[PDB]
Amino acid sequence: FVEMVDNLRGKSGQGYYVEMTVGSPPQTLNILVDTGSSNFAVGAAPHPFLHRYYQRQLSSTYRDLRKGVYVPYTQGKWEGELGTDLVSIPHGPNVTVRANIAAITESDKFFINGSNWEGILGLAYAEIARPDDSLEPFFDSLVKQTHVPNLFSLQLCGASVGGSMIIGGIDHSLYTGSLWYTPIRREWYYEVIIVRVEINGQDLKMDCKEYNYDKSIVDSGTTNLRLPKKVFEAAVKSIKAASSTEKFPDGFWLGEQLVCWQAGWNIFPVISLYLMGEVTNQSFRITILPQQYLRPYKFAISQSSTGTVMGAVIMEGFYVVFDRARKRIGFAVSACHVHDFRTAAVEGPFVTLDMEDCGYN
Ligand SMILES: CN1C(=O)C[C@@](C)([C@@H]2C[C@H]2c2ccccc2)N=C1N
Numbered sequence: 001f002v003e004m005v006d007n008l009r010g011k012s013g014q015g016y017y018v019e020m021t022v023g024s025p026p027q028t029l030n031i032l033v034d035t036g037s038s039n040f041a042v043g044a045a046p047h048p049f050l051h052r053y054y055q056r057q058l059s060s061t062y063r064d065l066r067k068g069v070y071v072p073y074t075q076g077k078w079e080g081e082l083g084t085d086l087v088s089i090p091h092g093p094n095v096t097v098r099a100n101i102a103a104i105t106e107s108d109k110f111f112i113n114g115s116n117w118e119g120i121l122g123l124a125y126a127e128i129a130r131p132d133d134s135l136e137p138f139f140d141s142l143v144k145q146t147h148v149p150n151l152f153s154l155q156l157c158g159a160s161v162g163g164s165m166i167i168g169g170i171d172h173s174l175y176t177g178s179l180w181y182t183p184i185r186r187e188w189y190y191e192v193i194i195v196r197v198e199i200n201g202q203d204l205k206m207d208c209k210e211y212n213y214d215k216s217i218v219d220s221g222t223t224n225l226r227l228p229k230k231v232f233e234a235a236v237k238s239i240k241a242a243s244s245t246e247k248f249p250d251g252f253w254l255g256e257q258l259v260c261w262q263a264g265w266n267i268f269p270v271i272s273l274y275l276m277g278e279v280t281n282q283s284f285r286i287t288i289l290p291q292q293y294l295r296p297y298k299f300a301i302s303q304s305s306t307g308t309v310m311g312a313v314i315m316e317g318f319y320v321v322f323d324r325a326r327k328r329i330g331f332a333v334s335a336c337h338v339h340d341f342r343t344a345a346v347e348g349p350f351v352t353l354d355m356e357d358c359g360y361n
Pocket of ligand 1: 219
């Protein structure tokens, strides 16, 4: 898939985007790659902060759906007008698809002043698509209308950042070792189940339901490793305890402040998440380094009321395969992850009982 390798661009903290074309004749747009939502939504009006926007008046293949959608968030918000058009991905499958498009006509604190992307590619499932699950997400259209296989994979490599979105397959050069698969619990978000958490090898000994309360998702659209409050609580003290060589202000661990050192790692613990495996009572762990959770530094582990979010802190350490056809997600050590002595790891198999109990209901 040499043509799809390195098809992702971005800026640090502003997300990863892929180039797409929309309409006839094609209009090029940079589009955020977002495994955490399910709408294909593009700016369609001259917002001052956007480099370009979808102009429906220029497209011969645009079709109005005569329906509006309103989408609020934790901070941001957008509303738009639904329609359909021909969509392509220049550095992807040589293929063209009619997909739903939410033409964004108004927004607040959503788009990023400074970013080079003007749209969102929600790669998650219909169940959380807005207004409702009747609105066929892009990837479902891609699979129905073409012979592109029902999966994609992401390597996020991390001032410019880069990566690859292999659509319809797996490029074996982007990972070392073996891929280990965790089941997608339910097809809405990419929901997974964490069955054990170790800081530096030491179990936090929490009930495994807390790790996934109320959920645990894989989200390319999130920067941090976001954990539920109670888990995050226990995580920080363990990490703090493991890092007693030097001291830090309490507020910083809450992201309410930054920290900085001098040019020219070991005083920080590795972090392992055990995931439900493919077989009963078997699991595997993914391990990250401080080079993943200390972003150039800021502590890149936050607390959450929406559950565990495995954001770029996790994804930049691994090659992640979204095997939709087999309802599972594969993790492998990324060939582009930054390391020291130590190295990001994906290891198994392990025996873990009652893993299904770790899920929340
Ligand atoms: C975490 N998340 C959101 O808050 C909503 C969206 C749709 C939004 C595109 C993500 C985003 C995060 C920060 C700034 C702008 C957009 N995607 C997400 N996965």
